[PDB]
Amino acid sequence: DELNLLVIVVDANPIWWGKQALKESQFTLSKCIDAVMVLGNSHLFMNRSNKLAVIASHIQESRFLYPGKNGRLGDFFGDPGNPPEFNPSGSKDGKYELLTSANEVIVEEIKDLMTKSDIKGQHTETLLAGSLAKALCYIHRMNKEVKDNQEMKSRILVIKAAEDSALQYMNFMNVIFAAQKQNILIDACVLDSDSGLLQQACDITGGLYLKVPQMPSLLQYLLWVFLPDQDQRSQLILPPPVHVDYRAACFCHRNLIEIGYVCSVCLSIFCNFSPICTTCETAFKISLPPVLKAK
């Protein structure tokens, strides 16, 4: 009758989660899996014909927790919409049969990722921008097949847990405009680290930049506010209103742009104090720097 989908972006960082347990915390890496155990079950409780998709965010890649990339959930998909070759567990979805198998793949897939973390390469942080690049390619493959009869109303869930690295932040903005064409909604669930790039994904598409206070109070802000139904979110009003506002400034310059000009004719927004070129190989006439420098 109707199917749904929820893409959860888990920021599984062994560096951040490995140091949080030292500060006397009860919500560590072992308890982070319980969030998918509850959200994955409450999503199927409203409709047993739904689908689950969990994507991790490791310091080396964005491993797919469900379905995995191994020989079990890689070539053959364990989705409920495939009765053949999958029915010892995909038959009693109305309780703890298929829901347990959905969490078992996450535990089986994380085994190869936790053991492959020798941290011998100094520090590289988590490539958070590469996590959303894999979610758009997964929701487009299933939409081409389900476009007939059904519609499949889905959303995008992002859980932030750490900062970024030496990655170009321009790649994080390409997934924002690529998702607006499909008329999809992007969320954000920060925990401790704050960034101005993730908040842009909630203002362009019309999402919600929620700030989680304490860690154990996570099941409340992911069930009612981050509901995949997105039918009563316009009149919900539960998280506090957005007070701060972070956007974007200069590209390759150490200043906050507000009236500055680019280098010449390219796209590198710099400043107004530039009579000639800067970091390119172009030129610029002297019919304006003599005017701007005066006043």
Decide: is 185 part of the binding site for other proteins (CB under 8 A). Answer: no
Q: Which residues contact 71 (CB under 8 A, 6 or more apart)?
A: none
- Of the pair 232, 265, the CB lying nearest other proteins is at 265
Number of residues in contact with Zn ion under rule CB under 5 A: 4
- Cβ atoms of 159 and 132 closer than 8 Å: no
Stretch near other proteins under the rule CB under 8 A, chosen from 93-101, 121-129, 210-218, 220-228:
121-129
Which residues, 6+ apart, have CB-to-CB distance to 105 below 8 Å? Answer: 65, 66, 67, 68, 72, 73, 78
Partner whose footprint covers residue 85, from other proteins, Zn ion, none (CB < 5 to 8 Å by kind): none
Cα(278)–Cα(255) distance, integer angstroms: 15
Which of these ranges, 36-44, 62-70, 101-109, 216-224, lies near other proteins under the rule CB under 8 A? 62-70
- Minimum distance from CB of 66 to Zn ion (Å)? 17
User: Binding segment for other proteins among 9-17, 35-43, 84-92, 95-103 (CB under 8 A)?
Assistant: 9-17
Of 26, 30, 83, 285, the residue at the interface with other proteins (CB under 8 A) is 285
Instruction: Calculate the dihedral angle through the C-alpha atoms of 67, 71, 72, 78, rounding to the nearest 10 degrees.
Output: 50
The entry of other proteins, Zn ion, none that residue 248 binds, CB within 5 to 8 Å by partner kind: other proteins
| Least distance in angstroms from the C-beta of 30 to Zn ion | 33
The residue whose two tokens read 């970024």 is: 164
Across the beta sheet with 64-66, the strand order is: 64-66, 51-56, 4-10, 153-158
Residues 127 and 62: beta-carbon distance below 8 Å: yes
Tell me the C-alpha distance between 223 and 162, whole Å.
Answer: 22
Instruction: Return the residues of window 124-183 that contact other proteins according to CB under 8 A.
Output: 124-125, 127, 129-130, 133-134, 136-138, 140-141, 144, 162-171, 173-182
Given 107, 280, 288, 292, the residue binding Zn ion (CB under 5 A): 280
3-state secondary structure of 18: helix
Q: How far is the CB of 187 from other proteins (least distance, A)?
A: 17
For the bound state, the minimum distance from the C-beta of residue 168 to other proteins, rounded and expressed in Å, comes to: 6
Name the segment binding other proteins (CB under 8 A); options: 91-99, 146-154, 220-228, 258-266: 258-266
Contact with other proteins (CB under 8 A) among 85, 120, 183, 213: 120
Among 11-19, 36-44, 149-157, 222-230, which window interacts with other proteins (CB under 8 A)? 11-19
Cα angle, residue 129 at apex, residues 127 and 132 outer, rounded to 5°? 120
Residues 218 to 277: which contact Zn ion by CB under 5 A? 263-264, 266
Rounded least distance, CB 96 to other proteins, Å = 26
H helices of the chain, in order, are 14-20, 29-46, 98-115, 129-146, 170-180, 200-204, 289-292
Among 56, 34, 58, 57, CA closest to 116: 58
Instruction: Tell whether residue 81 is a contact of other proteins (CB under 8 A).
Output: no
**Contact positions vs Zn ion (CB under 5 A):** 263-264, 266, 280
